[model samples]
Target chain A: TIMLTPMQTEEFRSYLTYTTKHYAEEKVKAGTWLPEDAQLLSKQVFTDLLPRGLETPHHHLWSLKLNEKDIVGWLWIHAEPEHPQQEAFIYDFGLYEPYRGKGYAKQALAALDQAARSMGIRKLSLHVFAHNQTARKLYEQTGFQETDVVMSKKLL
Target chain B: TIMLTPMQTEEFRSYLTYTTKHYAEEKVKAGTWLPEDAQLLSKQVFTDLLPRGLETPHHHLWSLKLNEKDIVGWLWIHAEPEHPQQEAFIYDFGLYEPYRGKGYAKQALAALDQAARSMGIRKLSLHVFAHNQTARKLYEQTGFQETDVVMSKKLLE
Candidate 1:
């Protein structure tokens, strides 16, 4: 029974700062970014994009909870305007380590669907890296479909 | 009756330049790049990679053909040394439009496997874009398995 609650501005600020550094390490470990430049680049990119903190237009942040207790994870979404059907994208997502390996993500996705539909968004999108096999499996199982795949080979 | 013939350096030079430009457009058309920057970035990237081109150790480039005639495609591979099992990778591959959908790609893959094994390479790996289902299907049909799947959704339309 997962539910989405609007994150408070203070918590949202902490998330933006913390996730910036965390995401950089993940991308560099996943080989998507150059190690030498990833840290600064990640911090700069997020700051530029989220200059308004919690007041960014069309961007929403939420906390996942179970039985209205114990925050499970955070969800960030970006909405775009369109005719007859606005769209939404998963700007960032995660389930805290302690709450993972359960069915919380699926519940969170169901909650996201309802939330988006309530906002009149007809489509939702997200990007998953190749090295994140666990998250990829969950995404596929939750009905996410692929729109593209960037492939590469390491020659040594 | 497809075979692979090593292209001369002059031809290789021409191919690299043309393909670099060609691939940039293809990527931009596929919405994978910023239209304004793809061309320059493409050329710069290729130049960075030029230090180890056709003449680099264990790198192979070949013109694909049909029965010793009718050049149909290009194949690029990078071979890595090994102990009991040498491995290689497909850096790039394609077929000319006029010769596609005629089972020539499958023939070419079989030929590629044989050529690599003959040179003592044991395993081959490659990447296929998600939009390229045609190629993915062919690769799977020829005994390839998915090592990873990277998915994306576009809301910027």
Candidate 2:
């Protein structure tokens, strides 16, 4: 079991940086994105994509290592205190490319679900991109279903 | 009168893309962001961050304008017949940064509130940055109370 400590922040940050770059490169090579989006994707991923405002919300960052080799996967839980018992977000779940196709993702989720259950959360949620097919597959495998669609419309 | 066309699906994709980047830079410079958050921010800002296979939601993109001056704002209403007369989201709201700090934000919000009230919404809700004192003030001046706080607790497992 990973012991809880504030020192883990840097470790999470490094893993995220590498993972994001890796994901962005894969997406650009897929040619499924528009040039405009490719330009957008070239930047840092997790830090660029996640909401980080003071009022944004509260979330937990989780990580797991394989026999001290290194962290292989991560997950986040964004919680809403108003309904403390429900409406927690499980976002930014990713594993290093080397760890892909293994049962690491599944095991991590089962463990996280246990954490949510203990917190009285009725549902755990996360967002998946239209382009990120692999991550979506993992989420569905773990029984997460759609809740809502966030979109933008030209106001002008 | 400005002619308004319904915002298309393609437009929604682009709008989210643009705004997500904008929000990311702002958050980073504000110095309140956790590093891992950047990637998720870009992906989640889009309302439809879903696997390509998921069933698409039935939603409408609406806009309002007064003459040649463009009034930029939108409302996405769910097409569920039950909530037809129910709440719609104030999904995207922004003004060119240069035009900010005037009254445009307030004006837009007031108008949006009136529109929501007209459409049968009772409460006006949104997630604003806790550190954005200006935004919080504007929202409070318009009577948006704190509905909830999003807080985190670490798990050892």
Candidate 3:
């Protein structure tokens, strides 16, 4: 069974730096942001998100554990206690390559659903790239629907 | 004053060739598909989509006209006449760079909505790249909401 455990101090430091840089790189690679802008913006986002590090408000960072021993992944959640209507956002989530496709992601999501509901978070939202077909299918099978499509054509 | 008119034979040929090549190039840029596979797959898709050209059932390709004079854009749609529940797909759409941000795209979508309904197409669908912030915002303002988010992370090396 998979479970969530609070990230330890050393791990949290790594998480903050790594996730921030990784997000910036991914956004640029995905063409969502330019290099110069992504670096600046993503760092600022992490700063605002983790102002007090482990004591940051509304941020939930946990290590995904398997069999109570191995760390298989991590889940980063953003839920505002006072803004229930804003819903919860899955800020970041990852399952180590070996653990992926083994249904652990699904299990984690199921657990998160229960956790969110218990916290009075009525809804959840996330962003998925069109290129990640596997993840898209997972979300759909898990009861999500496509509400927006941002089409593009290069004129330049 | 924009009107949807059937594309000519020559234009359709260009559309098939150009769009196929362009889609392959874009996929390669995104690093999701290899160049060879993207080329082969894109061609196969066009083959399936345009087997009968303008006569293909459920396919609508048109030149976007403005004021009966200028050709400002193009719209490609796949609407299944025998399958109302299947939903219409905006296969491809474009506005010439010079004509964009002038509200033509929005106007065109509004018209497409009416056209789809008249033909009994109750829903429409499309795919957009994550990098295109302008297009994303446009979709949101036009009554579309995100139904799914696909996140990715590289492994610690």
Candidate 4:
């Protein structure tokens, strides 16, 4: 069991630092951007998405807590609170290293579903890398459908 | 105007050779498979998906032709013709180099829509690499919605 609470200032700051670097690395690994340029580009993307930081309109950042105190992970989603029958996009979701492998991620998703329902969201969507088979399987088992796949090949 | 024709024996053979190599290279590029093992893995994937080559059940391969003469591109899809409201997945779609940037790709997609409707397919889905912004934009402009995105980051040793 877990509770989703708004991220505190320090937590949000830490998450921001880690996430920007991680996103930069991912883009570099995906061959979308050169390593030298990825960090700046990734920072730009985050800034564009979260112009107001934790106070960003329509974006929710939640810290997954166990027993009302233990922070297990975090989830970030975007949705319009006033809109009904809308779709929510999960921007990021992850558990801290020590907290993984015990079904917490699945429980967090269920909690998210309830939270989304209360916000009038009718659908939840997220992106998963094709190489992440474990995460892919989990999403499939949790009733998330594959709506699109992006495959690429480099040309000489 | 374009015509969708079934691939002939030689075309299929050529496509197979090119595609398997391309798929292997893609997997390597995506960091999903090691270069040494990617070719074998790619071949296995294709073999699994199309066990009977051009005659594979539920799979359709069409050559995009201009005025029923010039081969502009090819599209491969999978669907069960007997099933209504079925979703079809585009296994591959590409135009030869010279045929690109001339609006042939868009026409091929429109033709695909008509062909899909005749096969009782109600939805068409495909995967595009995140790096392929051009293709992604084209898909969005054509009414395709993004359903999922996968992201990853490597950890230090």
Cα lDDT tens digits, model 2, B1-157, are 3223355554455444545654664564454454368546646655353333113354445443333334334443333434644645444465432134556667766666666666567655566665667778877888878878755444641
Best by TM-score: 4
Look at candidate 1 and tell me the lDDT of residue A129: 76
Model 4: C-alpha RMSD to truth? 20.0
CA lDDT of each prediction against the hidden true structure: 0.78, 0.56, 0.75, 0.82
Worst 10 residues of 2 chain B by lDDT: B47-56
TM-score of 4: 0.49
Between candidates 1 and 2, the lDDT winner? 1
Q: Measured against the native two-chain assembly using Cα atoms, what DockQ does each of the candidate structures obtain, in the order listed?
A: 0.01, 0.02, 0.01, 0.01
Candidate 1: pairs in clash: none
* DockQ value for model 1: 0.01
The candidates, ranked best first by lDDT, are 4, 1, 3, 2
> What does candidate 1's lDDT look like per residue over A12-101, in tens digits?
877776677667756765567864576688889888877887778788899888866688888999887564557788988887644664
> Looking at candidate 3, what is the lDDT of residue A118?
87
Residue by residue across A1-156, what tens digits does model 3's lDDT show?
A: 778888889767866666776677567556777756876798898888778887988888888888666777888888867774968888887775435546888888887788779888988887776655557768888887887876555686
* Candidate 2 local lDDT, residue B2: 23
Error of 2 at B127 (Å): 53
lDDT (C-alpha) at residue A117 in model 4: 89
Report interface Cα RMSD per prediction: 19.3, 14.5, 13.2, 14.5
DockQ, Cα level, model 2: 0.02
